[PDB]
């Protein structure tokens, strides 16, 4: 099974990665972008119309939209409103779905919070009450003036904590008050997997597309893939005892003289002897020890002669070899 | 004579969801026999009756649905409203916890419903069933 | 800059009026018929929980409410002398015997010192509740999700109430709110149980959508808040038919939300909205007069016109030659109230009570009237065939309504309410050219990033390799542009030394092919199958 | 019943025939040969591609006149219909729906759509988008009324 892999791969460092994927998302399409961003621009008056009427906005489509998101609540909607109605402006509370250490209860005493503490809404916290909170919450709703006071964004709603069911229904019951307007996007392609006719009931979500192709900047950074081991031990033997750059010379040299596999290995017992031919190694002991360290920090194998060998590939020794042994 | 010949301790629903969850449910039976080794040959757009049933994946499901379905359809909102609505009834559940399955990491389906109502639910939509099921 | 830290606040019409007299006046007729449904259900429970005097007197009463939404509130009659509490137990708190157990006695209790003006909490409650609390109780179990529940933990959870049947001062009533399939539910139980059950069971019906019964109001109140001032098309109302059947559970709610966002579009784009009230007529101008003209029916009664009249110079007079006599011409027709709508409250009320039929949908029944598909919409009972000549009404073609009109003649709320979702974005991806319009004349010969292997992604197999996929990557990049984009900033200096590389382009590529695939995951378009290896991945993604 | 007598090769000078009465400029009419060229190695039947890839792109290099004039669509189609002898209608329309998708993960159509500046643009980015203030085709446009205004009023007077 001849397969190119991804350890086949011409690698690239920290600093040269991140720099040259900056020059691209701020330089490639960059006239085109702007010229989607004044067309869509039309569209918003028609958001502040719909909003009144209590509807749940959601937003799809490919690309990153959170920097659609922010313009588009922060600056134009917000004080628009506040002008509208007749003094600090409507307070906007974003929820960073992509960030995963979002919890039901944290962004709800917030909540609260920043709804009106008209009663003594703390007697009837006691033990889940959240739900029986905002029950109480939602019938005294039903009678006031109809005025929004609050608009949230909830970016990423497919995230990796807002995605869990007793948060979901959380946010729906959220959605039937007639107070707060909910605005927020997804990204998955499985969204819609979400929601049943229950909550839909308590959403009534009106769906619109922005495509603009965006790299997601702050997104990208939670995740990772095997550019975030031999990338790992390559900074470990840049501190460490000169010694040990030699014996693990001498290691990747025989290690290497036979893909960077087991039978390419060495025994313990003649690797002592050259080690101690160097005069490096004065017994099994001494040797084992900064051994150990090179097996702490995962940096060789060992398996069965008792052939201990380097988990690395077979471009990447003699990278090894000519960079930082060198 | 008449009670003492009846047991009077039960107090078959034609089921309440609309047709297009209907054919989504006939779809889902479908996994309890068929492999992916046979499946694609056999419903080409060109017995375990008694056993447990298989696990599924997501989008095997709409790739029978398509087939199956009376491009005289495309728009796969509504369909995917009936999904999460079949998971509140129980009909269809998850091999894991009941907390992840929306994003896809791996995660399993099957159905809980027996061949009975499958099969009232077949005809209650004009649709044969037995055809397919074949040991 | 802080969009790494979570959820931070910070603080930063002549056409609309005359909605806004016409939408919160519908609203009082939507609100005041769901209060009617919810005093409905609301007293139909309360009767029924009382008066049921059986003579073992030693079961609990057991309702279930079939059909029902897991949302039903219910509210509880005061009857003095004895307390009277409502325990709710979601499946979510349902763990195990234990805590459906604890979490139970809890909310009781507190609901026990609130109206009484150290204990433990169990059973114990139960039976000195005659002398912790001097009046008796009368508990009630609204079980909100009952068929998610792990049903072995509920039938051992009502044999631990089956105990507490003899104390004789409290008495047990329990409501099962299923979602549907009361078959299903006795297959679960075990069967010593439903013997205990079925002593006094009630297989009372709550449904928003039985026999139409509000179905068929609240779309008739919807049509006398918008009577003669508008019309609905037939292609409007079949979605309407079509889409509503596509959800069982709640069509009420639906029907509010497709309804008054078609009415929002009205608003938001005809100019002829502001003349429903021939108090407006001051408001008129040529360019009024000018977009008047492009009507269908407007110009397709001027070809009547020619050939009826074959002088035709009175109606080229009567065309922009005049404009008096042409905005005149308009105003003959303007105040046609349609009686469509008044035949149908005609024919509505009557096989109501008449003939006394109830199995019938009144959008359909106003469908078939535009069709004149009424005389083979009654045939379905065969009941009006002594009056199927008294209910008739051939629907005239009507002049002038195509500007008082709702129609998805333009697939808007098809689209911005069902939107094809996958198809949306598939169709975004490939194509691309239609979505998007120095350093732009790369971007004519050079596809945007996420789009470009999108068209590989399709002609790949079902499980791929990845480095393959990048190799068939590098074909699709011609080289020489790359290296004219990389050197085309002499500002910086730092990419300026990489820009200098030989090996440059086929490190630019690695560095952008893993921004693309690194944004192929949050959209669970492609799948790392078998992490801590990674060297294959899986596309469940396909084109329909 | 020309289309279904299929394993003939379309030469140089057979598909340059088939593309100057359609009348094709030069930019297109070597690239369905680069294009048959690429697909003359992968085929499964010859006549059914050649004919679905040369409906599409006048239908959108003659859009000038086929969304002026909705008469000429029937016009092109049936004067294939003619010369590739079909059955009827139906199935030549099976072929244009087929290869339009199968010809929507190239680059040149890409490049066709936006080198021609013909589609229209303003719509489709209002249309997706889902835009309010979009076009609703309950009415005749103000250009094909005015298209049947001075026709008519003409012929009237």
């Given at each position: 099974k001849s397969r190119h892999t991804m350890s086949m791969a011409p690698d690239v460092t920290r600093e040269e990665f991140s720099l040259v994927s900056n020059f691209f998302n701020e330089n490639f399409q960059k006239r085109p972008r702007q010229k989607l961003f004044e067309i869509q621009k039309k569209m918003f008056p028609q958001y502040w119309f719909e909003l009144t009427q209590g509807f749940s906005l959601l937003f799809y489509g490919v690309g990153s939209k959170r920097n659609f998101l922010e313009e588009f609540a922060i600056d134009y909607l917000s004080p628009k409103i506040a002008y509208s109605q007749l003094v600090n402006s409507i307070p906007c509370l974003i929820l960073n779905g992509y960030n995963p250490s979002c919890n039901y209860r944290d962004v709800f005493k917030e909540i609260t919070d920043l709804l009106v503490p008209a009663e003594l809404t703390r007697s009837e916290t006691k033990g889940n009450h959240v739900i029986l909170q905002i029950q109480k919450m939602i019938d005294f709703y039903k009678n006031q003036p109809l005025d929004i006071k609050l608009i949230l964004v909830v970016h990423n709603l497919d995230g990796p904590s807002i995605r869990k069911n007793t948060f979901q229904t959380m946010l729906s019951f959220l959605s039937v008050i007639r107070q707060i307007a909910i605005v927020a996007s997804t990204?998955?392609?499985?969204?819609?997997?979400?929601?049943?006719?229950?909550?839909?009931?308590?959403?009534?979500?009106?769906?619109?597309?922005?495509?603009?192709?965006?790299?997601?900047?702050?997104?990208?950074?939670?995740?990772?893939?095997?550019?975030?081991?031999?990338?790992?031990?390559?900074?470990?033997?840049?501190?460490?005892?000169?010694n040990s750059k030699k014996m693990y010379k001498l290691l990747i040299e025989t290690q290497m003289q036979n893909r960077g596999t087991q039978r390419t290995g060495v025994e313990l017992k003649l690797f002592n002897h050259l080690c101690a031919a160097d005069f490096i190694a004065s017994n099994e002991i001494a040797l084992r020890s900064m051994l150990r360290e090179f097996i702490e920090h995962k940096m060789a194998n060992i398996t069965k002669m008792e052939i201990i060998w380097v988990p690395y590939t077979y471009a990447e020794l003699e990278k090894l070899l000519k960079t930082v042994l060198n | 004579?008449?009670?003492?010949?009846?047991?009077?301790?039960?107090?078959?629903?034609?089921?309440?969801?609309?047709?297009?969850?209907?054919?989504?449910?006939?779809?889902?039976?479908?996994?309890?026999?068929?492999?992916?080794?046979?499946?694609?040959?056999?419903?080409?757009?060109?017995?375990?009756?008694?056993?447990?049933?298989?696990?599924?994946?997501?989008?095997?499901?709409?790739?029978?649905?398509?087939?199956?379905?009376?491009?005289?359809?495309?728009?796969?909102?509504?369909?995917?409203?009936?999904?999460?609505?079949?998971?509140?009834?129980?009909?269809?559940?998850?091999?894991?916890?009941?907390?992840?399955?929306?994003?896809?990491?791996?995660?399993?389906?099957?159905?809980?419903?027996?061949?009975?109502?499958?099969?009232?639910i077949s005809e209650s939509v004009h649709f044969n069933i037995s055809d397919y099921f074949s040991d | 800059?802080?969009?790494?830290?979570?959820?931070?606040?910070?603080?930063?019409?002549?056409?609309?009026?005359?909605?806004?007299?016409?939408?919160?006046?519908?609203?009082?007729?939507?609100?005041?018929?769901?209060?009617?449904?919810?005093?409905?259900?609301?007293?139909?429970?309360?009767?029924?929980?009382?008066?049921?005097?059986?003579?073992?007197?030693?079961?609990?009463?057991?309702?279930?409410?079939?059909?029902?939404?897991?949302?039903?509130?219910?509210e509880l009659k005061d009857e003095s002398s004895r307390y009277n509490v409502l325990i709710e137990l979601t499946p979510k708190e349902s763990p195990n015997v234990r805590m459906m157990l604890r979490r139970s006695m809890y909310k009781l209790y507190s609901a026990a010192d609130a109206?009484?003006?150290?204990?433990?909490?169990?059973?114990?409650?139960?039976?000195?509740?005659?002398?912790?609390?001097?009046?008796?109780?009368?508990?009630?179990?609204?079980?909100?999700?009952?068929?998610?529940?792990?049903?072995?933990?509920?039938?051992?959870?009502?044999?631990?109430?089956?105990?507490?049947?003899?104390?004789?001062?409290?008495?047990?009533?329990?409501?099962?709110?299923?979602?549907?399939?009361?078959?299903?539910?006795?297959?679960?139980?075990?069967?010593?149980?439903?013997?205990?059950?079925?002593?006094?069971?009630?297989?009372?019906?709550?449904?928003?959508?039985?026999?139409?019964?509000?179905?068929?109001?609240?779309?008739?109140?919807?049509?006398?808040?918008?009577?003669?001032?508008?019309?609905?098309?037939?292609?409007?109302?079949?979605?309407?038919?079509?889409?509503?059947?596509?959800?069982?559970?709640?069509?009420?709610?639906?029907?509010?939300?497709?309804?008054?966002?078609?009415?929002?579009?009205?608003?938001?784009?005809?100019?002829?909205?502001?003349?429903?009230?021939?108090?407006?007529?001051?408001?008129?101008?040529?360019?009024?007069?000018?977009?008047?003209?492009?009507?269908?029916?407007?110009?397709?009664?001027?070809?009547?016109?020619?050939?009826?009249?074959?002088?035709?110079?009175?109606?080229?007079?009567?065309?922009?030659?005049?404009?008096?006599?042409?905005?005149?011409?308009?105003?003959?027709?303007?105040?046609?109230?349609?009686?469509?709508?008044?035949?149908?409250?005609?024919?509505?009320?009557?096989?109501?009570?008449?003939?006394?039929?109830?199995?019938?949908?009144?959008?359909?029944?106003?469908?078939?009237?535009?069709?004149?598909?009424?005389?083979?919409?009654?045939?379905?009972?065969?009941?009006?065939?002594?009056?199927?000549?008294?209910?008739?009404?051939?629907?005239?073609?009507?002049?002038?309504?195509?500007?008082?009109?709702?129609?998805?003649?333009?697939?808007?709320?098809?689209?911005?309410?069902?939107?094809?979702?996958?198809?949306?974005?598939?169709?975004?991806?490939?194509?691309?050219?239609?979505?998007?319009?120095?350093?732009?004349?790369?971007?004519?010969?050079?596809?945007?990033?996420?789009?470009?292997?999108?068209?590989?992604?399709?002609?790949?197999?079902?499980?791929?390799?990845?480095?393959?996929?990048?190799?068939?990557?590098?074909?699709?990049?011609?080289?020489?542009?790359?290296?004219?984009?990389?050197?085309?900033?002499?500002?910086?200096?730092?990419?300026?030394?990489?820009?200098?590389?030989?090996?440059?382009?086929?490190?630019?590529?690695?560095?952008?092919?893993?921004?693309?695939?690194?944004?192929?995951?949050?959209?669970?378009?492609?799948?790392?199958?078998?992490?801590?290896?990674?060297?294959?991945?899986?596309?469940?993604?396909?084109?329909? | 019943s020309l289309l279904v007598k299929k394993y003939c090769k379309m030469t140089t000078e057979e598909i340059i025939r088939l593309c100057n009465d359609f009348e094709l400029p030069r930019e297109v009419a070597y690239k369905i040969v680069d294009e048959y060229n690429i697909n003359a190695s992968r085929l499964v039947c010859p006549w059914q591609l050649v004919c679905g890839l040369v409906l599409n792109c006048t239908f959108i290099v003659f859009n000038e006149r086929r969304r002026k004039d909705p008469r000429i669509d029937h016009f092109i189609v049936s004067k294939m219909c003619s010369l590739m002898l079909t059955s009827k209608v139906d199935d030549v329309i099976e072929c244009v729906k087929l290869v339009k998708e199968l010809i929507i993960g190239e680059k040149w159509f890409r490049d066709l759509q936006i080198r021609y500046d013909d589609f229209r643009y303003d719509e489709i980015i209002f249309r997706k988008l889902g835009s309010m203030l979009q076009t609703t085709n309950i009415l005749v446009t103000d250009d094909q009324y005015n298209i049947w205004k001075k026709r008519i009023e003409m012929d009237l007077a």
């Open positions: 990204d998955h392609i499985y969204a819609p997997l979400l929601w049943d006719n229950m909550k839909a009931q308590n959403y009534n979500f009106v769906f619109h597309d922005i495509s603009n192709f965006e790299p997601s900047t702050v997104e990208s950074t939670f995740q990772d893939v095997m550019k975030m081991g031999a990338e790992g031990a390559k900074y470990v033997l840049q501190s460490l005892t000169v | 004579i008449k009670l003492f010949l009846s047991t009077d301790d039960n107090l078959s629903q034609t089921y309440d969801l609309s047709i297009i969850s209907k054919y989504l449910l006939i779809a889902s039976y479908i996994c309890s026999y068929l492999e992916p080794r046979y499946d694609a040959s056999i419903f080409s757009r060109k017995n375990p009756r008694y056993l447990q049933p298989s696990l599924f994946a997501i989008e095997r499901l709409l790739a029978i649905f398509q087939a199956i379905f009376p491009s005289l359809m495309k728009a796969n909102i509504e369909v995917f409203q009936n999904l999460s609505e079949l998971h509140t009834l129980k009909l269809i559940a998850t091999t894991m916890n009941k907390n992840i399955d929306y994003l896809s990491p791996k995660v399993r389906w099957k159905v809980n419903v027996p061949w009975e109502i499958i099969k009232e | 800059a802080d969009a790494q830290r979570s959820h931070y606040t910070v603080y930063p019409e002549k056409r609309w009026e005359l909605y806004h007299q016409l939408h919160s006046h519908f609203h009082d007729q939507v609100d005041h018929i769901i209060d009617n449904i919810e005093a409905d259900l609301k007293a139909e429970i309360s009767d029924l929980l009382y008066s049921e005097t059986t003579q073992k007197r030693r079961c609990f009463n057991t309702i279930f409410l079939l059909g029902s939404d897991s949302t039903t509130k219910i109206e009484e003006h150290d204990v433990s909490y169990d059973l114990s409650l139960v039976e000195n509740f005659k002398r912790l609390f001097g009046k008796d109780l009368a508990m009630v179990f609204n079980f909100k999700d009952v068929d998610s529940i792990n049903f072995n933990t509920l039938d051992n959870f009502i044999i631990l109430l089956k105990s507490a049947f003899k104390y004789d001062h409290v008495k047990i009533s329990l409501i099962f709110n299923i979602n549907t399939n009361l078959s299903n539910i006795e297959k679960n139980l075990r069967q010593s149980t439903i013997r205990l059950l079925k002593r006094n069971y009630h297989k009372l019906d709550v449904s928003s959508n039985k026999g139409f019964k509000y179905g068929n109001q609240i779309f008739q109140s919807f049509l006398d808040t918008v009577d003669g001032k508008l019309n609905l098309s037939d292609r409007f109302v079949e979605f309407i038919l079509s889409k509503m059947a596509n959800n069982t559970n709640h069509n009420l709610q639906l029907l509010t939300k497709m309804l008054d966002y078609s009415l929002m579009s009205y608003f938001f784009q005809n100019a002829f909205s502001v003349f429903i009230d021939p108090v407006n007529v001051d408001f008129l101008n040529d360019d009024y007069l000018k977009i008047l003209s492009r009507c269908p029916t407007f110009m397709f009664f001027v070809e009547g016109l020619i050939k009826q009249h074959a002088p035709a110079d009175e109606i080229l007079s009567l065309l922009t030659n005049k404009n008096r006599g042409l905005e005149e011409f308009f105003v003959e027709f303007l105040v046609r109230e349609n009686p469509i709508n008044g035949h149908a409250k005609f024919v509505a009320r009557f096989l109501e009570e008449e003939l006394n039929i109830t199995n019938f949908n009144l959008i359909e029944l106003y469908h078939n009237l535009l069709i004149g598909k009424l005389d083979s919409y009654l045939d379905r009972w065969s009941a009006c065939k002594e009056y199927k000549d008294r209910l008739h009404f051939e629907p005239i073609d009507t002049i002038f309504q195509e500007l008082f009109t709702l129609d998805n003649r333009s697939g808007l709320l098809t689209q911005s309410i069902f939107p094809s979702y996958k198809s949306n974005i598939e169709d975004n991806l490939l194509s691309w050219e239609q979505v998007l319009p120095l350093s732009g004349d790369l971007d004519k010969i050079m596809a945007p990033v996420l789009g470009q292997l999108f068209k590989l992604y399709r002609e790949a197999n079902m499980t791929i390799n990845i480095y393959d996929f990048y190799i068939a990557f590098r074909e699709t990049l011609p080289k020489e542009e790359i290296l004219n984009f990389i050197r085309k900033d002499p500002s910086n200096t730092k990419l300026l030394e990489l820009a200098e590389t030989p090996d440059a382009f086929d490190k630019v590529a690695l560095i952008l092919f893993m921004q693309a695939i690194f944004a192929f995951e949050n959209m669970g378009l492609i799948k790392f199958q078998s992490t801590k290896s990674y060297d294959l991945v899986e596309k469940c993604v396909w084109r329909g | -």
